[PDB]
Amino acid sequence: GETTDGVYRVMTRRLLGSTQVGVGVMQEGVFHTMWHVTKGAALRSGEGRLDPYWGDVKQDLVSYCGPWKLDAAWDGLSEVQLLAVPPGERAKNIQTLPGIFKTKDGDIGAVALDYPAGTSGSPILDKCGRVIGLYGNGVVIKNGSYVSAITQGKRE
Amino acid sequence: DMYIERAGDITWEKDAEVTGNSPRLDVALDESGDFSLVE
């Protein structure tokens, strides 16, 4: 159905009315989202169907129609924009300077912006508009606030 | 059955609302893709 490049909402009619479970990026004919949003299930786009192609529960990422296409990375210095697409509200760019998630396997950028769980899959962008990762997988701090990692896949 | 709806273009917006802090957090990632706080 609709394969135009851009940010999309991931919806469901299983619960009461229509509910936004997440968000994703359509790029180069491939739909990219977080695994916990779809659980690997097929998606509908108008009258067309999007079947999963690649997924991994640990990276919490999934691609539809083709392999992961997003390859840009945060440079460790610059501010970034979270293109937040929240449930029932318009898409909105929120600029922030990312912090760090220090892990046993290396450092990862992290955005400290709080949004509902249905915002999962919202793209994080660099100054050229390139997707450097997706928002939706992180942790809950002392504050009760949510700090998400800048989760990026690997392009083959 | 899940479905998708376009929500906009992927562009950088000059003069966007600049907010949010930059914390350095010690974390762990389990086999189920869940992060946790190491203290």
Ligand SMILES: O=C(Nc1ccc2c(c1)CNC2)c1cc(F)cc2[nH]nnc12
């Ligand atoms: O719960 C959230 N994310 C998530 C859920 C289930 C799983 C994973 C991540 C990875 N393994 C399975 C979440 C995402 C978000 F954008 C804002 C949030 N505020 N409180 N929780 C959130």
